[PDB]
Design an enzyme around this catalytic site. Structure first.
Site, PDB file in Angstrom:
ATOM      1  N   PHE A  69       3.757  -5.986 -10.899  1.00  0.00           N
ATOM      2  CA  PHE A  69       2.391  -5.283 -10.607  1.00  0.00           C
ATOM      3  C   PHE A  69       2.640  -4.180 -11.718  1.00  0.00           C
ATOM      4  O   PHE A  69       3.545  -3.517 -12.009  1.00  0.00           O
ATOM      5  CB  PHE A  69       2.686  -4.505  -9.159  1.00  0.00           C
ATOM      6  CG  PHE A  69       2.265  -5.509  -8.263  1.00  0.00           C
ATOM      7  CD1 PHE A  69       1.173  -5.853  -7.705  1.00  0.00           C
ATOM      8  CD2 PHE A  69       3.256  -6.185  -7.040  1.00  0.00           C
ATOM      9  CE1 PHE A  69       0.830  -6.809  -6.759  1.00  0.00           C
ATOM     10  CE2 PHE A  69       3.238  -6.841  -6.572  1.00  0.00           C
ATOM     11  CZ  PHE A  69       1.771  -7.200  -5.970  1.00  0.00           C
ATOM     12  N   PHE A  73      -2.645 -13.023 -10.086  1.00  0.00           N
ATOM     13  CA  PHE A  73      -3.344 -13.522  -8.934  1.00  0.00           C
ATOM     14  C   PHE A  73      -4.303 -12.334  -8.245  1.00  0.00           C
ATOM     15  O   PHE A  73      -5.026 -12.693  -7.425  1.00  0.00           O
ATOM     16  CB  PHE A  73      -2.267 -14.005  -8.201  1.00  0.00           C
ATOM     17  CG  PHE A  73      -1.350 -12.773  -7.625  1.00  0.00           C
ATOM     18  CD1 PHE A  73      -0.199 -12.327  -8.612  1.00  0.00           C
ATOM     19  CD2 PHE A  73      -1.567 -12.081  -6.334  1.00  0.00           C
ATOM     20  CE1 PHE A  73       0.656 -11.467  -7.969  1.00  0.00           C
ATOM     21  CE2 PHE A  73      -0.745 -11.053  -6.035  1.00  0.00           C
ATOM     22  CZ  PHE A  73       0.445 -10.789  -7.001  1.00  0.00           C
ATOM     23  N   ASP A  74      -3.910 -11.099  -8.697  1.00  0.00           N
ATOM     24  CA  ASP A  74      -4.764 -10.210  -8.290  1.00  0.00           C
ATOM     25  C   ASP A  74      -4.717  -8.885  -9.125  1.00  0.00           C
ATOM     26  O   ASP A  74      -3.935  -8.576  -9.995  1.00  0.00           O
ATOM     27  CB  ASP A  74      -4.325  -9.619  -6.695  1.00  0.00           C
ATOM     28  CG  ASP A  74      -5.118  -8.789  -5.852  1.00  0.00           C
ATOM     29  OD1 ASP A  74      -6.444  -8.448  -6.682  1.00  0.00           O
ATOM     30  OD2 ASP A  74      -4.770  -8.115  -5.121  1.00  0.00           O
ATOM     31  N   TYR A  97      -4.251  -1.500  -9.701  1.00  0.00           N
ATOM     32  CA  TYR A  97      -3.228  -2.312 -10.013  1.00  0.00           C
ATOM     33  C   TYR A  97      -3.471  -3.795 -10.534  1.00  0.00           C
ATOM     34  O   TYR A  97      -4.820  -4.130 -10.362  1.00  0.00           O
ATOM     35  CB  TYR A  97      -2.322  -2.541  -8.750  1.00  0.00           C
ATOM     36  CG  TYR A  97      -3.250  -3.447  -7.909  1.00  0.00           C
ATOM     37  CD1 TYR A  97      -4.059  -2.720  -6.799  1.00  0.00           C
ATOM     38  CD2 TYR A  97      -2.765  -4.867  -7.770  1.00  0.00           C
ATOM     39  CE1 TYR A  97      -4.712  -3.582  -5.955  1.00  0.00           C
ATOM     40  CE2 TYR A  97      -3.590  -5.316  -6.623  1.00  0.00           C
ATOM     41  CZ  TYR A  97      -4.496  -4.851  -5.664  1.00  0.00           C
ATOM     42  OH  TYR A  97      -5.174  -5.669  -4.778  1.00  0.00           O
ATOM     43  N   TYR A 127       6.029 -11.108   0.224  1.00  0.00           N
ATOM     44  CA  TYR A 127       5.794 -11.974   1.248  1.00  0.00           C
ATOM     45  C   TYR A 127       7.141 -12.942   1.605  1.00  0.00           C
ATOM     46  O   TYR A 127       7.243 -13.399   2.776  1.00  0.00           O
ATOM     47  CB  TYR A 127       4.483 -12.764   1.037  1.00  0.00           C
ATOM     48  CG  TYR A 127       3.504 -11.705   0.515  1.00  0.00           C
ATOM     49  CD1 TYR A 127       2.467 -11.570   1.756  1.00  0.00           C
ATOM     50  CD2 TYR A 127       3.264 -11.501  -0.556  1.00  0.00           C
ATOM     51  CE1 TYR A 127       1.291 -10.752   1.440  1.00  0.00           C
ATOM     52  CE2 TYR A 127       1.956 -10.539  -0.878  1.00  0.00           C
ATOM     53  CZ  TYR A 127       1.076 -10.307   0.302  1.00  0.00           C
ATOM     54  OH  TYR A 127       0.106  -9.138  -0.140  1.00  0.00           O
ATOM     55  N   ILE A 149       2.717  -4.390   1.299  1.00  0.00           N
ATOM     56  CA  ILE A 149       4.089  -4.716   1.298  1.00  0.00           C
ATOM     57  C   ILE A 149       5.073  -3.654   1.215  1.00  0.00           C
ATOM     58  O   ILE A 149       4.839  -2.821   0.445  1.00  0.00           O
ATOM     59  CB  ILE A 149       3.996  -5.856   0.202  1.00  0.00           C
ATOM     60  CG1 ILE A 149       3.852  -5.482  -1.137  1.00  0.00           C
ATOM     61  CG2 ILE A 149       3.303  -7.175   0.682  1.00  0.00           C
ATOM     62  CD1 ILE A 149       3.975  -6.594  -2.204  1.00  0.00           C
TER      63      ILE A 149
END
EC number: 5.2.1.8
Lengths: 375, 387, 820, 107
Positions: free
Chosen positions: D99, D36-37, D26, D82, D56
């Site tokens: 994502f 961010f990731d 991902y 979140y 999540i």
């Protein structure tokens, strides 16, 4: 408990190994003698094959030993509230101190050879700033007792043994150009913290040794934890030994400087400060005599405390003698108008009565011999 | 009022006195027993005096008429009263020594002796070790005083504090003259501000508190650092640091020089920006490297933070904040979220300045101890935006 | 733009370099939660790419190397480095095989030294813990300060160590080439970032035996061979690189020291078995000695009637060759220890050529050569090189100072010891961070886990060696230091540390003595400890002298003077915390004064007897500050002891004078009860200061003077009056509900118990008529009240239980003495 | 609040069920375009089991709709991620997450 003590072969292996390590280090590692101070100082005092140019480089960058002293001199001059404990300085101060002394009818020829050999070993240090470092470290401690100041005093004594005039001149010159008051303020504070004979501490120890305490893991036979009666007697002796060596050889300039520091903004009379401690020591000795005055025989613990008190009193008397010999008229007048006469009167009272008391039993002849030479 | 006080006061500037003989020529000659002289407090400029109302006090120079302010040192309390000694034209014979001679202070006109007031009980619980100094006919046996020399550095600093305090107080009261009185189309209607004196005084003090150069050797650098810390403490203990803050606060109520011109005129407003920058520069010098001075901001921290957005002295105020944070761990423990957001807002409004980053770095760790709250707040309010 | 463009854009280069510094600051000193957040901004790929980027500017290259260490390795390295100073060696078969020298044929006294850092080390070190950086996991439902502490972000260590080795190897070859464009713009920027990474990984123990050999080849390819490739030591690097080289050599010097400790522990395991087997055999044959010996059998069995520590001291006393008669060991067993002693000295380079041939000679030659080649200007480098030099010259002394931190444990207790080390590592990590709500929970649970571990109680010496009590004390005082006067925060942490130290003292006398060395340190922090309730630093100080005559007699007068000065202050000012809670302002603090009184109670009364040395000092200190006696017993204008107690009872019965008048606060303080408790504590302290009977019968002048002073302070009639005071009795009424007194707000039998102790010890009961007078007014009414309470309803009441304790500890024992 | 937009088709037959480990690669970005990731940077696939609430809740439905080998774009509303609390220092409050997820295999 003796008849039910556990034999060693019944202990668990890990417990026995821990006991072995404690026994092995005390009997085999501590007892081992390894002299490396002379070899280490010699190695650090050599300049390394840089003499193939011989140009105007004659500035002569410090040798490894010289750089070590400058580093410790650097941290002593650092503006700090408290001189923090440094094991590295303590380790090297002992190494430098142990490398300078290295010491039944000695002849004249080798007597001078020992003095010259002593001077050379001291020359390896004071020519590399060690004399100034000792003064800076004493000024840095600000009158706080500890291992740092004790190591510094021992090093200062090591380079001043025999009355080294060259070291005395360097120390005196450094103090006069800096005109700092911290050095004598630190010295005065240290002398006020020196302990004397305390009967309350002595009474507590006698009861403590009568209990016969033991530990849990096994059994300790009357553990010998630190003495609490004149615990810093060795520190007191070297503190006054250091002051004596500053005036050794009838150094009139240093004798006058201890009494008064002309260049400084404030003046501390070390000569008077020595008498102040002598009075406190004399009063403690007088109190100790009264404690045993009623008793017929002085027991072993009392004799040992008497012996260390007399040893300190010998150093103070020697220090006072070194102040005024030469003669130093200023110090003689200072002592004449001081409370020295009160201390001498008190000592004569103790000397007269102790001589009569100690002579009544031969078991205290050794203590009597020590008393006589103190007189 | 005069007190016998011990502790840190023995190294402060408010315990310094100047002995002034009653003559101009050869006033620097050796002091003699029974010689009349005035005793002047260096920082305040007042003279020890005997008044019919309050007894022993310190009075201004306009009330020192050689009768209330004449004192002499005597070796003993015996009533000699031999004869008035005649002064000689020279240094004279040296009589009184520093730190050895025991001196009894006697008021010449009245004959009273300087002594303590024997403080009343039930006041020891208050922690008042101070004993009020009084003039008494008999006194006590321990009334003798030791005269100890003062270093030239401290003596010069104490006189500078006296002159600096008088100038800034005059400057402060001048600002309060037109605090809420617009001049309109006319003069400010008051005495002119000492603008030129304040600017020169600020520049002298900034150079007086300059940190030693890093190129010096270790030995003299530490000596200069020790002197610098002593001088910073001397000024702070006399209220100079609080005096500078009062000057800043009264000048900070004007948003710009033009706004300041509406109350002090154009000729005074053209130096408004210069003075405020010097005030912050002096404030940083008074606290740079001094933890005791920096710890004073642990009670007033919004004072510094709320001024970060001021445009006239943006760089000076940031330097003041940086000096406080790198020295006082107490200030780091009072840092709140609004303080950090204000500092982060400085990056958004003043651009990418690396000094603001250094300020944020100092909020996290001080003296090897990290503050979790500061680290989390900086991370929360600065990183996720990615702007 | 390409980040390589920052080599010419200096404005952005400085800002970005300081940005990396800010990244290290926010995650500095164990802030693992922020470290995970930074992985979202500077990911693993960026960090690994930056390490190998040869065109990065120096400030950026140094910044990214330090950023990687801060995010991933700083926490693990610091925790590991703290454990490297201790040597906990389990007695495992791996430990047994450890020898000082590798098996070889060089020499019997000493073979050639093995490669430092290469071999088997059995010293216990807790493993590193890491968590994978993931930003898609569900956020924990656990609240803040309650969720488990975050671990450091995980990065592949095996790949990282290979890259660090490869980069260092390339730099050595590149440094040999003398290129005019070194990586990072200078030789310093090329080696220092790489050496910091290698040094960090070495401390963490990431490198294996083969990896360590490669590092040693780079440092010195000629000395470190087992049986332009120039080493780092001869590449003429600047001072900054030399500082990093000292760190590398410091690690290998530590490994040699650790090897000596483990080898010494290994030999101890083998030698103890022979000692135990021989002693068992010697004892077996000694049981038949009566057939060929006589009374001197006591001399031979003297060993078996001695403590085991003394037994092993005698067995090892055969070194000087003048003590070969008291030692009963056979010569073959003696030889094994002497053989090991010779090769131990040889391994330390004591006694038994341009090539150093060993680490000890290499380091000593290198340090001297560096100092005589140039005037070193970095004070950090000067200290590092001379510290390293001192270790080489004094190897035996270095081993001597490391043995106190060495400890051997059974292999069956390894798992519990590892758990204890993990908890201790958490506590040690709190010495570098300001206390907060999250750190408070970690500290509390770490203490609880330690006190739940059997090793903590089985091996008190090991806990003392680890400095566990010092670490807990330093954490406590940091919290007490901040807000030392206005308010104490995190009270639960303080009472957890104090309770831990109190149990620490009760494990052994040696632990109690260790805490006694900080008695003055605890007392100076005990001034504000009155605010916290439960276990306080004053309680820790009291627990360090309780029931120990040796420590009681060693109690300095300054410590007692410090406590009395605190007691004097409580007798002159009200409690500031109570005043802020609306309490009426009485001119003293009975609550604070009582806490100091009970500390003096333990200092003067040990094992049921009064310590006259401490008792005399306390009494003299108390009378020199008469305000320690409270508003009563003040002398002028002061009511008597009986009047004060009667006044306190009226205060207790009347609200708006006993409390705030707004338990209600769950620890509500009642001034009426507080006043009685103070005087009861004061009378108890004075009673325990009374001289023992054998001193009075001996006619000692000091003992008689002290008792006379105590009698003057407390008159006998006041003692009888207080004992004769009525006690509220649980009655029945109003449907049959029990009307019981509140023991925390009323006169209690414990107050009377203190008076009885003073009466017995100070005055005593010597005549029959006085005994009868005390009974019918003070004792008999209380005895009847307790007897009447022995019913179905009132037997288990709090007052009835208090009466039973009062009678069975104060009254009835006194009557038994006065039976004749 | 999960919208699944396909990028590359998978097998279209096998789908992850409850109790089965999903191995995915991902790359997560905020809906404004800020990454961010990413599991690609760490070069290690991310493994999780459906139904255990390890990730999540937006990933729970999003991955369940994907097939093995399929690469899809999941847009998750703040409620399914979140949300108001957010991820301190990574994800701002009330942030929509995007994502790019590839379902490598199931185990």
């Amino acid at each position: 408990a003796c008849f039910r003590m556990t034999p060693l072969y019944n202990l668990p292996t890990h417990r026995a190994c821990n006991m072995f390590l404690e026994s092995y280090k005390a009997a085999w590692i501590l007892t081992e003698d390894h002299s490396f101070e002379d070899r280490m100082i010699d190695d650090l005092s050599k300049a390394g094959e840089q003499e193939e140019e011989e140009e105007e480089v004659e500035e002569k960058k410090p040798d490894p030993l010289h750089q070590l002293v400058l580093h410790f001199s650097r941290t002593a001059l650092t503006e700090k509230s408290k001189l923090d404990e440094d094991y590295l300085y303590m380790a090297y101060a002992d190494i430098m101190a142990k490398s300078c002394h290295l010491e039944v009818e000695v002849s004249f020829e080798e007597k001078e050879m020992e003095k010259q050999r002593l001077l050379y070993q001291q020359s390896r240090l004071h020519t590399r700033g060690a004399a100034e470092m000792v003064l800076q470290m004493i000024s840095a401690c600000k009158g706080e007792t500890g291992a740092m100041v004790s190591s510094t005093l021992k090093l200062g004594i090591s380079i001043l043994n025999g009355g080294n005039a060259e070291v005395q001149q360097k120390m005196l010159d450094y103090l006069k150009d800096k005109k700092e008051v911290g050095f004598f303020q630190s010295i005065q504070a240290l002398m006020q913290t020196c302990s004397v004979l305390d009967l309350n501490a002595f009474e507590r120890q006698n009861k403590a040794e009568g209990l016969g305490m033991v530990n849990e893991d096994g059994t300790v036979i009357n553990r010998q934890n630190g003495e609490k009666v004149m615990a810093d007697d060795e520190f007191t002796q070297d503190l006054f030994r250091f002051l004596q060596l500053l005036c050794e050889g009838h150094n009139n300039d240093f004798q006058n400087y201890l009494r008064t520091q002309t260049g400084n903004t404030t003046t501390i009379n070390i000569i008077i400060c020595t008498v102040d401690y002598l009075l406190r020591l004399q009063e403690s000795i007088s109190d100790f005599y009264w404690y045993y005055s009623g008793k017929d025989v002085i027991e072993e613990q009392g004799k040992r405390n008497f012996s260390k008190a007399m040893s300190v009193a010998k150093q103070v008397f020697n220090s006072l003698t070194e102040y005024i010999q030469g003669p130093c008229t200023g110090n003689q007048q200072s002592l004449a108008h001081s409370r020295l006469w009160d201390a001498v009167v008190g000592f004569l009272h103790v000397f007269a009565h102790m001589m009569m008391k100690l002579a009544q039993d031969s078991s205290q002849i050794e203590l009597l011999k020590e008393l006589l030479d103190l007189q | 009022l005069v007190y016998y006080e011990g502790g840190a006061v023995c190294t402060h500037a408010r315990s310094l006195w100047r002995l002034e003989p009653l003559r101009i020529s050869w006033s620097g000659s050796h002091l003699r027993w029974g010689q009349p002289l005035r005793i002047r407090h260096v920082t305040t400029g007042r003279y020890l005096a005997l008044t019919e109302d309050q007894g022993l006090v310190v009075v201004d120079a306009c009330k020192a008429h050689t009768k209330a302010t004449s004192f002499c040192f005597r070796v003993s309390k015996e009533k000699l009263d031999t004869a008035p000694k005649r002064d000689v034209e020279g240094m004279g014979p040296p009589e009184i020594k520093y730190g050895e001679s025991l001196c009894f202070v006697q008021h010449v006109a009245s004959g009273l002796w300087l002594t303590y007031a024997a403080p009343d009980p039930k006041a020891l619980r208050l922690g008042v070790l101070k004993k009020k100094a009084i003039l008494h006919q008999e006194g006590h046996m321990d009334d003798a005083l030791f005269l100890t020399r003062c270093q030239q550095e401290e003596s010069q600093a104490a006189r500078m504090i006296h002159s600096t305090a008088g100038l800034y107080n005059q400057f402060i009261k001048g600002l309060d003259s037109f605090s809420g009185k617009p001049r309109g189309s006319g003069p400010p209607a008051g005495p002119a501000l000492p603008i030129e004196a304040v600017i020169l005084s600020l520049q002298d003090l900034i150079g007086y508190f300059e940190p030693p150069s890093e190129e010096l050797q270790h030995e003299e650098k530490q000596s200069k650092l020790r002197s610098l810390r002593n001088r910073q403490s001397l000024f702070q203990e006399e209220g100079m640091l609080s005096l500078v803050l009062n000057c800043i606060d009264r000048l900070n109520v004007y948003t710009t020089a033009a706004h300041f011109a509406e109350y002090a005129g154009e000729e005074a407003a053209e130096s408004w920006k210069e003075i405020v920058n010097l005030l912050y520069e002096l404030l940083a010098s008074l606290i740079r490297g001094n933890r005791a001075n920096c710890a004073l901001f642990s009670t007033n921290l919004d004072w510094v933070v709320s001024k970060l957005d001021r445009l006239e002295a943006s760089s000076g105020i940031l330097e003041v904040l940086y000096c406080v944070l790198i020295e006082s761990p107490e200030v780091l423990n009072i840092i709140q979220e609004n303080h950090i957001k204000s500092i982060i807002s400085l990056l958004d409004k003043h651009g990418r300045n690396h000094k603001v980053l250094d300020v944020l770095c100092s909020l996290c760790v001080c003296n090897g101890v990290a503050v979790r709250s500061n680290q989390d707040l900086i991370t929360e309010n600065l990183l996720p935006g990615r702007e | 733009m390409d980040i390589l463009e920052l080599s010419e854009r200096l404005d952005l280069q400085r800002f970005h370099s300081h940005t990396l510094r800010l990244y290290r600051a926010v995650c500095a000193l164990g802030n693992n939660r922020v470290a995970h957040a930074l992985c979202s901004h500077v990911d693993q790929a960026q960090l690994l790419h930056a390490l190998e980027d040869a065109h990065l500017p120096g400030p950026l290259r140094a910044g990214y190397y330090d950023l990687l260490i801060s995010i991933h390795l700083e926490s693990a390295c610091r925790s590991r480095r703290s454990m490297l100073s201790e040597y906990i060696v389990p007695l495992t078969p791996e430990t047994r095989a450890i020898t000082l020298f590798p098996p070889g044929r060089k020499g019997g006294n000493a073979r050639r030294h093995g490669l430092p850092g290469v071999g088997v080390t059995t010293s216990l070190r807790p493993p590193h813990h890491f968590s994978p950086p993931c930003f898609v996991a569900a956020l924990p439902a656990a609240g803040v300060a309650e969720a488990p502490a975050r671990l450091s972000p995980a990065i592949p260590l095996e790949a990282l160590r290979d890259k660090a080795l490869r980069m260092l190897g390339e730099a050595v070859r590149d440094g040999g080439q003398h290129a005019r464009d070194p990586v990072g713009g200078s030789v310093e920027f090329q080696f220092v970032p790489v050496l910091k990474l290698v040094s960090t990984l070495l401390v963490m123990g990431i490198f294996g035996d083969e990896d360590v050999k490669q590092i040693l080849k780079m440092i010195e390819p000629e000395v470190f061979t087992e049986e332009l490739e120039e080493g780092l030591l001869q590449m003429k690097l600047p001072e900054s690189v030399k500082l990093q080289m000292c760190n590398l050599l410091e690690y290998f010097c530590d490994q040699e020291l650790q090897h000596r400790v483990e080898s010494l522990a290994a030999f101890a395991e083998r030698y103890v078995d022979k000692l135990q087997a021989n002693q068992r055999s010697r004892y077996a044959l000694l049981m038949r000695a009566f057939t060929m010996s006589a009374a001197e059998t006591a001399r031979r069995t003297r060993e078996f009637r001695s403590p085991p520590q003394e037994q092993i001291n005698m067995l090892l006393h055969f070194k000087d060759e003048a003590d070969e008669e008291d030692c009963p060991l056979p010569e073959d067993i003696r030889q094994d220890l002497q053989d090991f002693h010779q090769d131990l000295l040889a391994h330390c380079g004591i006694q038994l050529e341009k090539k150093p041939q060993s680490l000890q000679e290499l380091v000593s030659h290198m340090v001297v050569r560096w100092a005589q080649e140039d005037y070193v200007q970095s004070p950090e480098l000067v200290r590092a090189m001379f510290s390293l030099l001192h270790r080489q010259y004094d190897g035996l002394g270095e081993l001597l100072r490391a043995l106190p931190r060495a400890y051997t444990i059974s292999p069956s207790s390894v798992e519990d010891t590892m758990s204890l080390l993990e908890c201790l590592g958490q506590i040690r990590s709190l010495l570098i961070v300001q206390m907060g709500p999250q750190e408070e929970n970690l500290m509390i649970q770490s203490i609880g886990n330690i006190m739940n571990n059997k090793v903590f109680y089985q091996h008190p010496n090991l806990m003392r060696a680890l400095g566990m009590h010092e670490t807990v004390m330093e954490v406590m005082v940091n919290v007490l230091g901040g807000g030392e006067t206005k308010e104490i925060r995190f009270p639960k942490m303080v009472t957890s540390c104090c309770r831990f130290l109190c149990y620490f003292c009760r494990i052994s006398r040696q632990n109690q003595r260790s805490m006694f060395d900080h008695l003055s340190y605890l007392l100076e922090n005990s001034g504000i400890g009155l605010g916290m309730q439960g276990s306080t630093p004053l309680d820790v100080a009291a627990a360090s002298v309780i029931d120990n005559n040796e420590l009681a007699l060693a109690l300095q007068e300054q410590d007692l003077e410090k406590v009395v000065s605190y007691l004097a202050g409580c007798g002159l000012q009200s409690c500031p915390m109570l005043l802020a809670k609306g309490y009426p302002d009485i001119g003293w603090n009975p609550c604070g004064g009582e806490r100091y009184l009970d500390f003096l109670r333990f200092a003067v009364f040990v094992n049921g007897e009064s310590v006259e040395e401490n008792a005399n000092v306390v009494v003299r200190l108390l009378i020199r500050k008469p305000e320690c006696f409270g508003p009563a017993l003040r002398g002028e204008g002061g009511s008597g002891l009986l009047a004060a107690i009667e006044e306190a009872i009226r205060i207790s019965e009347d609200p708006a004078r006993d409390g705030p008048g707004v338990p209600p606060e769950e620890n509500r303080v009642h001034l009426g009860h507080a006043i009685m408790s103070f005087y009861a504590a004061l009378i108890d302290l004075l009673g325990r200061c009374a001289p023992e009977m054998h001193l009075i019968q001996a006619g000692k002048g000091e003992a008689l003077r002290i008792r006379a002073i105590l009698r003057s302070l407390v008159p006998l009639d006041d003692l009888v009056g207080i004992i004769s005071l009525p006690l509220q009795i649980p009655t029945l009424g109003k449907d049959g509900a029990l009307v019981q007194p509140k023991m925390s707000a009323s006169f209690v039998p414990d107050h009377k118990a203190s008076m009885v102790l003073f009466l017995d010890r100070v005055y005593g009961i010597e005549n029959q008529d006085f005994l009868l007078h005390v009974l019918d007014v003070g004792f008999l009414p209380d005895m009847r009240a307790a007897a009447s309470l022995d019913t179905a309803t009132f037997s288990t009441t709090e007052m009835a239980l208090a009466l039973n304790r009062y009678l069975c500890l104060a009254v009835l024992p006194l009557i038994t003495k006065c039976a004749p | 609040g999960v919208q699944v937009e396909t990028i590359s088709p998978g097998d279209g037959r096998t789908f992850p069920k409850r109790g089965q480990t999903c191995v995915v690669h991902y790359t997560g970005m905020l809906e404004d375009g800020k990454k961010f990731d990413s599991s690609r940077d760490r070069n290690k696939p991310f493994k999780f089991m459906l139904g255990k609430q390890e990730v999540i809740r937006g990933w729970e439905e999003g991955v369940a709709q994907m097939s093995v080998g399929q690469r899809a774009k999941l847009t998750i509303s703040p409620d399914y991620a979140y949300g108001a609390t957010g991820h301190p220092g990574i994800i701002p409050p009330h942030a929509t997450l995007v994502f790019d997820v590839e379902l490598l295999k199931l185990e």
